Design a protein that fits this description.
Sufe protein. Chain: A, 3-stranded antiparallel beta sheet, 3 strands, 15% strand, binds zinc ion, NIF_FeS_clus_asmbl_NifU_N, EC 2.-.-.-, 2 iron, 2 sulfur cluster binding, metal-binding, ferrous iron binding
Amino acid sequence: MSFNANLDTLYRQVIMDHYKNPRNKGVLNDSIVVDMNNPTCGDRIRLTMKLDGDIVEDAKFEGEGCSISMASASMMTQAIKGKDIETALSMSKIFSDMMQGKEYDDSIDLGDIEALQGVSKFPARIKCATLSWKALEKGVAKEEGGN
Ligand SMILES: [Zn+2]
């Protein structure tokens, strides 16, 4: 194939490490219920979280669609499930800081960024990059505190 291929393995290990985990069928309403679908494909994911303050204490995710979308979300949610609000706001600031600074997450936990960096930038995956990442952003992220 005349492509970089640099994404396949990334999300392969992503969908594979997550296979060890529960799948892409979980939803709750103890806090916030985030839903995002890409009508262009069939891509849809639901990040339902449980944040009793400024911490994500639980997060259940439902996903169906492209192999990368349902993979990146469920992997990074599994990682996000163990974060705080400030940290995840930083994950969104980091997503913004990456493309300009060349560095990214000082913790190197990039479950979504790794999988979606290749997604975010294809005309065929960009609507899915809004699907997955922006939903993840709409879950506990914002990039900027408000400035
Ligand atoms: Zn798609």
